[PDB]
């Protein structure tokens, strides 16, 4: 039946989600000014950012971060457990969300809460997305990477158009409660970033703590996490236990990348070029 949980014109996973809830989230859910949400189009960096911040509160000690699945560390409001937990939870609070602007709880535009929106080069999101979602149980699947490429360049995928999703919050980049990051700068120099974060979030830590943090927060340490990699995720969620590679240039065919360039051009043309590190 459909193969996707359609809500408000947007594809959602069947398992672990619920329309009533996606609504119990927009015209019902209550956001506090002392809340933290990592805003991300799926497969853009959430897990990392999540760990980083998680490290903040733990001030380096990766003990916690290690023995707790991220969905628990930073729940997804939109999701059942996410909502279920988030609500029966004490403040302050931190959570993730892939929701496009228009689906985000209205109670946020009133409050002053702090939201971080880590944006990532779409081409790499397309790839990572592909492999990941093709191994996700109970949802339409592309018969071919050429097909997934088609789906993505039209939005016809989970959580809608990445273009859309971006165009949606960019106009909100200037608020004092919205910090816009990007994959590039989170990798090409994890230092700055962490600064802007603790800064924007309004926090400081010992030097020997910012030390311990930096350690457990660089790519390696990250792409080596048995939590930030899901690991022990119900086999019902994934089609293959092992699947649990490469840069978008190792995946985009020359024509594709080409077509995809005329795409970003036309589509993003109404925005500041400076807005995208990646070429
Ligand atoms: C797909 C995803 C949100 C899009 C992410 O960047 C990839 C994440 C994998 C783990 C999923 C999560 C949505 C909510 C789920 C379904 C849960 O509640 C437990 C497993 C969770």
In short:
This protein is α/β, with parallel strands linked by helices and 279 residues long. It is 40% helix and 10% strand.
CATH architecture, by name, is: 3-Layer(aba) Sandwich
CATH topology: Rossmann fold
Order of helices and strands: EEHEHHHHEHEHHHEHHHHH
By CATH, the superfamily comes out as P-loop containing nucleotide triphosphate hydrolases
Q: Helical content, roughly? A: 40-55%
Protein name: Sulfotransferase 2A1
Main location: cytoplasm
Enzyme class: transferase
Subunit structure: Homodimer.
Tags for this model:
monomer; 279 residues; alpha/beta; Rossmann fold; four-stranded parallel beta sheet; two-stranded antiparallel sheet; 14 helices; 40% helix; binds (3Beta,5alpha)-3-Hydroxyandrostan-17-one
Give an overview of the whole structure.
By secondary structure, the protein is α/β, with parallel strands linked by helices. It has helices spanning 19-24, 46-58, 63-66, 70-73, 80-87, 107-110, 122-134, 145-152, 162-169, 183-187, 190-200, 207-215, 219-222, 254-268, and strands spanning 5-7, 10-12, 35-39, 93-97, 114-119, 178-182. The protein has a 4-stranded parallel β-sheet with strand order 4-3-5-6. (3Beta,5alpha)-3-Hydroxyandrostan-17-one is lined by residues 13, 16, 42-43, 46, 71, 76, 79, 81-82, 98, 230, 233, 237.
Question: Which secondary structure elements does this structure contain, and how are they paired or packed?
Answer:
Blueprint lengths: L4 E3 L2 E3 L6 H6 L10 E5 L6 H13 L4 H4 L3 H4 L6 H8 L5 E5 L9 H4 L3 E6 L2 H13 L10 H8 L9 H8 L8 E5 H5 L2 H11 L6 H9 L3 H4 L31 H15 L11
Parallel strand pairs: 3-4, 3-5, 5-6
Antiparallel strand pairs: 1-2
The chain binds (3Beta,5alpha)-3-Hydroxyandrostan-17-one (AOX).
